Design a binder for this molecule. Structure first.
Ligand SMILES: *[C@@H]1O[C@H](CO)[C@@H](O[C@H]2O[C@H](CO)[C@@H](O[C@@H]3O[C@H](CO)[C@@H](O)[C@H](O[C@@H]4O[C@H](CO)[C@@H](O[C@@H]5O[C@H](CO)[C@@H](O)[C@H](O)[C@@H]5O)[C@H](O)[C@@H]4O)[C@@H]3O)[C@H](O)[C@H]2NC(C)=O)[C@H](O)[C@H]1NC(C)=O
Length: 361
């Protein structure tokens, strides 16, 4: 069993305890840690933050304690225009240029693999995404010849039916990529005038419009398209999506007036770190879509949908029952890394819950 855990650069700058550095990551927790988002310039892979070489160093040092740990550098991200990927990958020149520039980067900085987080390729991009993957992987193979362990190659794919169907040639890309991460947590957003859970497990028998919008449908679908279960890792979010209620209505379908108030620490509308949610929860009312196996809280005109240890283990068993490669947790920085916000004196409570399940048979 795998546990792929992301670490995002921008989390350092958070204030108070919110600040987080690779420095605080428990070396034996996950099996794969992914530094989140490297840039691309002059078609070459490149750093982002002014101090990644430093933080790079600091994350890769964790392997001094856990030899089995592996680390990968992600490329792309949400604040990286999809166009920029498309532009690179449509002109063979740019593509190959980009590619031949990656292995040395990783070798130079201690990484064991590259991660492709091209956030949503288009209709016009499928044919080239297949290329990037192919060639990129061919290069990683030709470099093992130099007598070093072969660099890993993975990709974060959307879990949206349309999304996948629009820009993913799963069948192909699945046989090249060492593993595929399914972003099973973006099935809703403030862009929908009404309340909704973003990382539901099941379709839930009362609504029937977006059944394709749940981890189960996603998985079962990816399998159909051809991807094997030994390359699949299900995403598990460690944050929550919050809304500001446009009425006293709180039950399913209550109208939304817009995203939620920012977090003390995560400082950003619509989203909330687990540890922030832990504080929120106090004085809040907690419910749970028993149908879709996930909770939601409300306090005032603030409606929040999130994942708790329960819902998370729940999902964890799910992937075990479909025989998947492993689990993926989006944002360690978002978990209670210090373990002081969420009652129990446990560090990384959520990511642990999943580990403890996966550590089971
Ligand atoms: C991820 O990558 C991003 C793109 O590479 C990068 O953001 C950008 O990168 C550069 C800026 O560093 C940006 O370039 C310009 O934007 C300006 C307009 O707003 C233009 O004026 C500028 O045009 C020129 O480019 C020349 C250099 O590229 C510059 O010539 C010299 O450059 C030297 C210093 O830059 C200087 O020493 C020398 O004397 C030259 O003068 C020339 O003068 C002129 O100004 C660029 O178009 C990229 O376009 C922008 N990327 C895009 C496409 O949006 C991010 O920094 C990176 N992320 C992180 C955090 O690192």
């Amino acid at each position: 069993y795998k546990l792929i855990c992301y670490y995002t650069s921008w989390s350092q700058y958070r204030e108070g305890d919110g600040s987080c550095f690779p420095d605080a990551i428990d070396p034996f927790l996950c099996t794969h840690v992914i530094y989140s988002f490297a840039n691309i310039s002059n078609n070459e892979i490149d750093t982002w933050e002014w101090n990644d070489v430093t933080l790079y160093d600091t994350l890769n040092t964790l392997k001094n304690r856990n030899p089995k740990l592996k680390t990968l550098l992600s490329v792309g991200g949400w604040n990286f225009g999809p166009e920029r990927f498309s532009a690179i990958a449509s002109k063979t020149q740019s593509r190959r240029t980009f590619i031949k520039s990656v292995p040395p980067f990783l070798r130079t900085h201690g990484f064991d693999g590259l991660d492709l987080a091209w956030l949503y390729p288009g209709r016009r991009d499928k044919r080239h995404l297949t290329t990037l993957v192919k060639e990129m992987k061919a290069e990683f193979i030709r470099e093992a010849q130099a007598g070093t362990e072969q660099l890993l190659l993975s990709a974060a794919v959307s879990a949206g039916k349309i999304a996948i169907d629009r820009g993913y040639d799963i069948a192909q890309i699945s046989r090249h990529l060492d593993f595929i991460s399914l972003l099973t947590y973006d099935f809703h957003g403030a862009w929908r005038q009404t309340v909704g859970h973003h990382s539901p497990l099941f379709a839930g028998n009362e609504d029937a419009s977006s059944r394709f919008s749940n981890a189960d449908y996603a998985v079962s679908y990816m399998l159909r398209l051809g991807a094997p279960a030994n390359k699949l890792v299900m995403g598990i979010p460690t944050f929550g999506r919050s809304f500001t209620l446009a009425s006293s209505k709180t039950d399913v379908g209550a109208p939304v007036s817009g995203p939620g108030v920012p977090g003390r620490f995560t400082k950003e509308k619509g989203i909330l770190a687990y540890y922030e949610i832990c504080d929120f929860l106090h004085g809040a009312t907690t419910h749970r879509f028993r149908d879709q196996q996930v909770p939601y809280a409300t306090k005032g005109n603030q409606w929040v949908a999130y994942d708790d240890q329960e819902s998370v283990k729940n999902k964890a068993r799910y992937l075990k029952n479909r025989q998947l490669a492993g689990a993926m947790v989006w944002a360690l920085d978002l978990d209670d890394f210090r373990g002081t916000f969420c009652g129990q004196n446990l560090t990384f409570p959520l990511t642990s819950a999943v580990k403890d399940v996966l550590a089971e048979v």
